[PDB]
Symmetry: D3
Subunit: 172 residues, 6 copies
């Protein structure tokens, strides 16, 4: 017997200042946060319909640099899917992606963890990471790549919905 | 790709005057039709969420007594699930159920066709078919039984939703 | 920030066989359960809009009788509000309401716990508890009374929504 | 250009205690009001979909007996459609219906006002107005009749939606 | 009696690679398809509210270059409205528009077929078709012009909804 | 007690041609209006969910230059919140903001009126008002600033929803 909607536990990771919170707040509140208030840990929920199925997204917005690795391991174990976010004007955030990805694979003991690579701030003019390089990296991981802007809303729904679709594929 | 919601083709059958149209119109328009205007053939649509899945119900409301058996065979072949309706104050409509069920099995060439047995007009005081007898009949067919009233709306959503759940079970 | 809908933890209590599960399943699935499958402990969720506010109902469906429990107290203490259910054809279930109310006050350590008194099975002809008696009891507790039928769906939404309104009043 | 949903101004009238408020509160809040708190004047709104069209119902719930005639005239002039409610266990409320209908026609200076006749409290056992008599009355007016219960919710949505359908028909005359 | 939502049969036409599929998938799935998988024929559905009316969009996504004339004629006869798509960085796709428009008018035997002219890929910097020229072309046909991006979602809803509004105008 | 969704009366003001109508039509119809059809007065409605609460937005779209100051005063008195719109490629529309804000404060006799400063046409390349200047102005008023495009839809929902959030904050003071 159906006891209520399917729930998906999504975790947003990536370097400090890439726009993890801004992405999440744009999804939840349709609001662009212009201030940079560094996150410790925040949890959000939203019910959405994706491919005809109603679901409850439970979204954990994480800190760029996480002071306890015990707390990091805990959300990595609990998370069913991960948005790995870099900023397209910050080369270092892009180079950091491989470390977030390795950390997640180690904790989950798997090569095939649902993830989406997200290149955020695509509205800004000062691009330093080429779309082709990000696509190549994503292809090497076997995951989707989506360019986003928390400010214009480009790709924001798509990033979260795509991650849910990755989780569903992995669940069969 | 997901190309849009799942569609379910439902057919409502049963003897003249049992309330096939009234059930359908109550589901679609939240309206009780007090007049008895015999049906030839009418089709209705409604999008609903059942157990977290969005679907489009395509509902064929049939005539009690069908003049062309060619037209009957066509909707029976197209239908994915059947509400077999009798009126709880009309013993003959209940005895007719066996015949509707055999006709559907013959046309679809199957023993295992999604169906729900519906005892309608349960608001009326002159009951001639006992709940126990209908439950026994349904149990003998391996299908659900639901008591309904198109007038009070008791069981109306339940009858259609239960049929969708039967179709989904059969599809795996 | 708003971080997603408000959640309300509702607990359904009352004597064995009064229709606690049937009420809950009618709310969640729009389905009347005719069988009596005794509950140990089950949990349901549903997102609804009540007085213009979207919320997530977390509903705990309990057993009629765990004769001693440390375990019972623990799950009951999660509740923010309680539906106290009796059946209108079972005087003993009505007399038991006093004991469910005392148990709730003890576990929550409070005299003022959000609750609604629910008289279920109002469709049956074998009424033994009068509406006036139940209303008097509810008035003596300072809580709402609602007559329900899990079978006809009378009062089902109203019972749960009323409880949410009681919780909101208590929260201010 | 579409500027937002169509609005329909509905007025609920009828004798004191027939269930006008209980009907309206059942529609708006899915709540049965057991208490009898006589109304002075209350307004409610609800967005609904009727025959595939989204609309905003603005519902005026009136007093059974309206002491000052200026107030009554004002809402009758503003209302686009009227639910005329009686209780099926109260013959006097049923006999009053003709007078509510005449009062509406007088104030609006029209013979053709969208209305629905509503027989409420159909859950109660001591029925004194037969369904056939109400149907005959409604037929004599050329309007729909619906039996309702604010308690069980039978017919509640149907009554309000039917009234919207009557208003739409009148707007394409 | 209203028998369920109004259905609109929409057909998306235009040169190879202009983004017919990408537009449709963005509308249906909120997903940007970065890959170029040439279409043979795909059908999609979505229920939406446009100017307060609920409707069911049935969307036929066509091939740039259609190998069978019999298949082309069939969907052109069935389609109620047409999105004629070009890409704003592809002058040839813009010059092709009048051929798609003539083909539709010939098959439907009408001068007054509901259509919208869509300039897609408006996010790209390498624009070769001026907005003014497209507007002039649309004005010459008496139809709306909309600039879209399947990637950013600019204008995507607007293009489909505008076409529905054109169909509704033609239906009176 | 609950009588239907909460209503918010929003007024969109600012100089001629800044995109007041285009913003509103984008919100209501998901349609970009390319033509410049000067407004006299138009009213729009939309039901939305903001922070889990259902609300009915009643939006008054005003004329850039208002011929009767009696009519201006009336909508300013009725409005609960104001979107003050300039175009980011029109310096003069930005300098005019101060005047719309003063006019609103005068008519409402209050220093603390819910408002959002909206820099529209942010899709255009020919920017003449720097985001820093707009942010400073908004900070000086203690109100939010949002960059919008009626064409791309950037910030459109956010502008209206932010204004509702400002109204709600003011209603709990
Ligand atoms: N222009 C633009 N700015 C953005 C975008 N996303 C984020 N920003 C800006 O970048 C800054 C950082 O955003 P924030 O969401 O706080 O980043 P974060 O990744 O959560 N930081 P942390 O890990 O410290 O919690 C903010 O000032 C924000 O407005 C975007 O897509 N475009
Ligand atoms: N009291 C009551 N009357 C009902 C109920 N369902 C239908 N009716 C009434 O029964 C009569 C016939 O119903 P109808 O829907 O037209 O039956 P049908 O099975 O579609 N007839 P046909 O086969 O001729 O198309 C009508 O007078 C209708 O109002 C119900 O549940 N309760
Ligand atoms: N006629 C009628 N039967 C009801 C109603 N509610 C429940 N029932 C019937 O009563 C029986 C017991 O219902 P159930 O919901 O299992 O009761 P419960 O309170 O959950 N029992 P437990 O405490 O053991 O879990 C079932 O056969 C059910 O169909 C009602 O409103 N009307
Ligand atoms: N059993 C039952 N009781 C009802 C129904 N409708 C209303 N009542 C009861 O009838 C009494 C009066 O209802 P109320 O809605 O206040 O009537 P009203 O027509 O609004 N009165 P007034 O004209 O003074 O404002 C209340 O006790 C209410 O619970 C119904 O459908 N069923
Ligand atoms: N940047 C950008 N790329 C787009 C846009 N729309 C489509 N594309 C890209 O253009 C290519 C072709 O898109 P697709 O939808 O297959 O085009 P099509 O018109 O359906 N091709 P065909 O007629 O072969 O079926 C794809 O690479 C797609 O990513 C857009 O608006 N912006
Ligand atoms: N590129 C672009 N153009 C816009 C935007 N908003 C409005 N416009 C254009 O600017 C012109 C003016 O828009 P309009 O909405 O009529 O402005 P308005 O403030 O209502 N003028 P008025 O006060 O005369 O009623 C129109 O041609 C419109 O297409 C935008 O965000 N981007
Ligand atoms: C240690 N013993 C020697 C003495 C214990 O004596 C008693 C005597 C009476 C009681 C009592 O109040 N009975 C109520 C119980 C407990 O909870 C209930 C909850 C719901 C329904 C019935 C219930 O019955 C409980 C214990
Ligand atoms: C000094 N002021 C407080 C005066 C109040 O003035 C007025 C003036 C007019 C009105 C009015 O339109 N009354 C009729 C009512 C209002 O709501 C309605 C809603 C739905 C249907 C009819 C309605 O008619 C209500 C109040
Ligand atoms: C034995 N069967 C496989 C035969 C079915 O053959 C068919 C079925 C359908 C068609 C047909 O109508 N094609 C055009 C399409 C159908 O769907 C559409 C959806 C939306 C818009 C136009 C549409 O036109 C052509 C042949
Ligand atoms: Mg953060
Ligand atoms: Mg029929
Ligand atoms: Mg149980
Ligand atoms: Mg009243
Ligand atoms: Mg294609
Ligand atoms: Mg204007």
């Amino acid at each position: 017997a159906f006891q209520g909607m399917t729930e998906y536990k999504l975790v947003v990771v990536g370097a400090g200042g890439v726009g993890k919170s801004a992405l999440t707040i744009q999804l939840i509140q349709n609001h662009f946060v212009d201030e940079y208030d560094p996150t410790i840990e925040d949890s959000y929920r939203k019910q959405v319909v994706i491919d005809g199925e109603t679901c409850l997204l439970d979204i954990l917005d994480t800190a760029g640099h996480e002071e306890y690795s015990a707390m990091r391991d805990q959300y990595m174990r609990t998370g069913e899917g991960f948005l790995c976010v870099f900023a397209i004007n910050n080369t270092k955030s892009f180079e950091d992606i491989h470390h977030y990805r390795e950390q997640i694979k180690r904790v989950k003991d798997s090569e095939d963890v649902p993830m989406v690579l997200v290149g955020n701030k695509c509205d800004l003019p000062s691009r330093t990471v080429d779309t082709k390089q990000a696509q190549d990296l994503a292809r090497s991981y076997g995951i989707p790549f989506i360019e986003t802007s928390a400010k214009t809303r480009q790709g924001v729904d798509d990033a979260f919905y795509t991650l849910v679709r990755e989780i569903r594929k992995h669940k069969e």
